[PDB]
Symmetry: D2
Subunit: 237 residues, 4 copies
Amino acid sequence: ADTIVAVELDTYPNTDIGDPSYPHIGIDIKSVRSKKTAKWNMQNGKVGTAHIIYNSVGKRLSAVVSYPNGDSATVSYDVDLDNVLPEWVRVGLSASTGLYKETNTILSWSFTSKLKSNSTHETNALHFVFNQFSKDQKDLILQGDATTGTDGNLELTRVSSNGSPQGSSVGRALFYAPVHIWESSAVVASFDATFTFLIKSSDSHPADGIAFFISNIDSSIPSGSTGRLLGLFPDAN
Amino acid sequence: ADTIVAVELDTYPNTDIGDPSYPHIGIDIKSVRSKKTAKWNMQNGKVGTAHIIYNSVGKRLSAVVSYPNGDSATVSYDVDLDNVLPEWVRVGLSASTGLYKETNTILSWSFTSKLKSNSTHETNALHFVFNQFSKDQKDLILQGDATTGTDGNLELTRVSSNGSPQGSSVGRALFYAPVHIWESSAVVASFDATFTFLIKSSDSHPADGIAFFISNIDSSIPSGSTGRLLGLFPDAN
Amino acid sequence: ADTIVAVELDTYPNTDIGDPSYPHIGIDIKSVRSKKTAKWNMQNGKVGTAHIIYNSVGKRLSAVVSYPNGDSATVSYDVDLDNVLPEWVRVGLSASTGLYKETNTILSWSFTSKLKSNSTHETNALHFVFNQFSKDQKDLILQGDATTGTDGNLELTRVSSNGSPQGSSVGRALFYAPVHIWESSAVVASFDATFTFLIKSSDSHPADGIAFFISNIDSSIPSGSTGRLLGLFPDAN
Amino acid sequence: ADTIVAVELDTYPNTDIGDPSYPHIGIDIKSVRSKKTAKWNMQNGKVGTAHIIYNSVGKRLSAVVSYPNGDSATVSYDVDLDNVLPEWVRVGLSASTGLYKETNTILSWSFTSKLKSNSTHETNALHFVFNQFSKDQKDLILQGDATTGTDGNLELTRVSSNGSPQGSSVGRALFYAPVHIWESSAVVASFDATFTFLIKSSDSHPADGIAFFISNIDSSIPSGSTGRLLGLFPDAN
Ligand SMILES: OC[C@H]1O[C@H](O[C@H]2O[C@H](CO)[C@@H](O)[C@H](O)[C@H]2O)[C@H](O)[C@@H](O)[C@@H]1O
Ligand SMILES: OC[C@H]1O[C@H](O[C@H]2O[C@H](CO)[C@@H](O)[C@H](O)[C@H]2O)[C@H](O)[C@@H](O)[C@@H]1O
Ligand SMILES: OC[C@H]1O[C@H](O[C@H]2O[C@H](CO)[C@@H](O)[C@H](O)[C@H]2O)[C@H](O)[C@@H](O)[C@@H]1O
Ligand SMILES: OC[C@H]1O[C@H](O[C@H]2O[C@H](CO)[C@@H](O)[C@H](O)[C@H]2O)[C@H](O)[C@@H](O)[C@@H]1O
Ligand SMILES: [Ca+2]
Ligand SMILES: [Ca+2]
Ligand SMILES: [Ca+2]
Ligand SMILES: [Ca+2]
Ligand SMILES: [Mn+2]
Ligand SMILES: [Mn+2]
Ligand SMILES: [Mn+2]
Ligand SMILES: [Mn+2]
C-alpha cells in the first residue's frame, strides 16, 4: 500500500478506530490511527488555517490549526521521517465525507521543502503557493472527487450545484512535481505546509476531515477510503 | 511547433543564420534568431552564472551572464510575454553541440514565478532550486542527451566516460511541474531564473551553447535541433 | 538635500508643478516632478495595492497600482539607479496632506532587496514584510505625523480620534535597517516593494498621496514638505 | 542583565562552569551553562555550517553544526521561547577567545523570523542574508572586537595583520533592525538562522567558540565576557 504521513483535521470521532471522542487534529504516520491528537473545535463555516512544520534536526512533526478568533489546536509528534518516507514523495491535501458530510474547501495551500548543506547555505528547495486555484490547475493532480472552480478554491470533496456537500466523497490534490523530501547528505531536510480551509456543514455532525499528507509519488486514493479513512488509507489498521 | 522563449548563451557564431560574428547571449522569442544579443566572452572551463529576469509590469526580459573574474554580458529585450507564451508552460534548460562541441554542464538552477494580485501579498508562486542534481532527479524531465550525474551536475549534452563532450548532441531538462506563467487576473506576473554552468571545450571552437527556455508544457526537442538550433527550434527561421 | 527615488501615488494634480491634470502614479528621481507618470484613478475608500519592481539588469523602475475591481495603472521609467542612489539607503513610505486631505493608511508593506553575485545563489538579501503594524513597531522609524495603530495599520498622515484625516500633515515610515541597495561586486541588484493602502477622503478633493521611496540612510522629512511635496522633497524643482 | 537565548559552538570545555569535557554545541537559555549539549568535533581550518531552527508550534530549539565531510552534531531543547525572550529582540553572532584562541570567522549568516496567522497565510517577516560582508556593513551593529573586512568575512574576534587570532577577544555582530520574535496572536512564530564559519587555531587547544544569539534589543557585550562566557553572559551562573 502507499506510505502516508499526514496531518489530519478530523472533524468526526470514529472511536472504534481509535479517534478520541471529539473533533481533533492528529499526526498520522502510516496509519489513520493518529500517533498523536489534540482536541480541535472546528468552527463551522469559518476559514481555518493549518500549519504543518517538520525538520530533520528537531525531528518533530508539528501542526497547528487556528481560526481567526484565535482558537487553536496544536499537535506535535517526535518522529524521524527519514525512517518513514521514501526519499521522493508527493505532497497533497485530502479530504472525505461519509455518512455525515461537510464542505472540504481549500482556499489556499503553500508548501516548502528544503534540503540544506553538506556545505555553505546552498540548497535544493521546492516552494509553491496557491492563494487562488484555477479551474484548470495544471500543477495539481486532482484525484477522486477533488475539483478546482472559478471561485479560486479547491473543493476536495463533492459539492452540489447548490453548494451543499455530498456524502461518501473522497478527494485529493497533489502537487504535480515529486518532492525530494530527504536526502541523506542533507544536514537539514525541512518542510512546511500551510493551508486555509473552510469546513461548512448543516449536518448534525460534520465529517470527515481534511488532511495534508505526504505519500509515495505514485500515491492514489485507496479504494474504500471515504469516510473515516480520509482518502489516505486502505483500512483502519 | 512548440512556443519558445529563451535566453541563449550562444558559444558558436552561426553568422549565416543571424548570429553576430562572436559568441553572444541572446533573447529568443519564437526564433533562434535572437531579437536581441550581446557580445559574450565564454570563459572556457570556467563556471559562469546566468540570471534571467522578467516581470509583466516592466515587460522586459533581461539576462546577465557572468564569470568569477567579473566579466559580464547583459541583454534585455522589451516584450510582452503574455502575448507570446501560453498561460501554462514548462521551463527548462537546453543545450546542444554540432560539429563543434563543449560540455554543457549545469551545476545549479533556480527558478521563481509569481502571479501577484489585486489584493496584498496573496500570490501564486512556484520556486525551485537545484544546487545539486541527483542521478534520479525525479522532478526533472530529461530530454534527449541530458543526464543527471553522481557529480551532482546536470549534463545537458552527451559527455563520454572519459569526460569528453560529444558532437551532434542535444538535451534538455524541464522542471516537472507546469508553471502558470501568466494569469489574466494577476497584477504582476514575474519570473526569474538563475543557473550556473561550466562550458568546457578542447575543440577548435566550442559550440553550441546553453539556453534557459520556457515552452508549451508538452515541449519536446524538435527533430534535428542539434547544433546551432540549441535544442529549442525545428529550424533557423 | 536627501537623495530620493520614489514611486508616487499622487492623488492631487498640482498642474502648476508638472503634475498631469489628473491623479496619477509617477516615478520620482530626485524631484517631485515625476520623470514618468500615468493616469491613476484613486478609488476613494478602497484598498489599493502598489507593486514596485527594479533590477539592475533591465534598469527599469516599474510600478503598478491596482484595486480590487481590477483597475490598474502602471508606470515604468528606465533609469540606472546605481547612478542615483547611494550604496546604502533606507526605504520607506511617505504621505502628505495639504489644503486637501485624505487618510494615508498603509495596511501592509513588504520589501526585498538582493545583491546577487559572480557565483551562484550566494546573495545578500533583505526581506521584510508587515501585514500588520504594531503600536510599537520597533523596526520602523516613524517620522513626522506617522503612527502605527492598534488597528494594525500604519497611518502615514495625521488622523483625528474621530477617524478624520487632517490637512497639512506629513509623515513617513522607514525600515529601521539600512539597505544595501547596490554593491559594485554584484551582478544583479534588485528590489521590490509592495504595499497596500486605503486612501479615504470626504474632501472636495483628496490630497496629496503616498510614496514608496528610497533615500539616503539619514533621510528626514524636508521642512515644509506637506502637500504636493509628499514628504519627500524640500521644494518642487 | 541582558536576556540571552544562544546556540553555542563551544570549542573549549570549561568543566568548572558545567561544559562537558569535549568541544560541543549547546543550547543556552539565560545561562552559559547550556540546557543541552552534544559533542562536537570542530574541524580546524574547515568551513562549518550551523543551522538553528525554532518554531512556536513544536517549541523545540534545534541546532546542527556540520562540516563538508558530513560530520555533524545536533542538539535540541524543548523550550517555549515566548516565556524567555522579550517580544522584540536583536539577533546576533558572538564569539570569544581567552587564554586559548582561534579565528572566529563568519563567512555567511542568514536569519528568518516569521509571525504567521491569526488568519490566511499573511505574515510579518524579516529575512536577511549575508553571503559576503562588506567593510562597512551598515546593517550590522559590530560590538567589541568584531570587524568586517574586504575578504567578505566577519571576524568576530581579533585577528592580527598576519592572520593570527588573538586572546582575550570578544566580539559580536547584531543585525541592525530589531526583530519581532513573538507576538501572542501569532499562530506560528518561527525563526531560523544559518551561519558558516571558519574556526582555525594553531593553539594547543582552540577557544572559545561562536554563538548565534537572540537578545534584548539593547544588548551589549557584558563586561568580562571573553573566554568561556562567549560574549554573551556577565557571569557563569
Ligand atoms: O451506520 C453505518 C456507519 O455510519 C457512520 O460511519 C460512516 O460515516 C462517517 C462519516 O461521518 C465515517 O466516519 C465512516 O467511515 C462511515 O462509514 C458511523 O459512524 C458508523 O459507526 C456506522 O457503522
Ligand atoms: O554553430 C553551428 C553548429 O550547429 C550546426 O547546426 C546545423 O547542423 C545540422 C545539419 O543537418 C543540424 O543537426 C542542425 O540542427 C543545423 O541547424 C552544425 O551542426 C555544427 O557545426 C555547429 O557546432
Ligand atoms: O496638491 C497641492 C497640495 O499641496 C500643496 O503644497 C504646497 O503648500 C504649502 C505652502 O506653504 C507647503 O506646505 C507645501 O510643501 C507646498 O508645496 C498645498 O499645501 C495643498 O493645498 C494641497 O493639498
Ligand atoms: O589559568 C587561568 C585560566 O586559563 C584558562 O581559562 C581562560 O582561557 C579559556 C580560553 O580558552 C577561557 O575558557 C576562560 O574564560 C579563560 O579565563 C583555564 O581554562 C582556566 O581554568 C584558568 O583559570
Ligand atoms: Ca475520524
Ligand atoms: Ca550559434
Ligand atoms: Ca500632486
Ligand atoms: Ca566553553
Ligand atoms: Mn482521527
Ligand atoms: Mn545566437
Ligand atoms: Mn505628481
Ligand atoms: Mn559550553
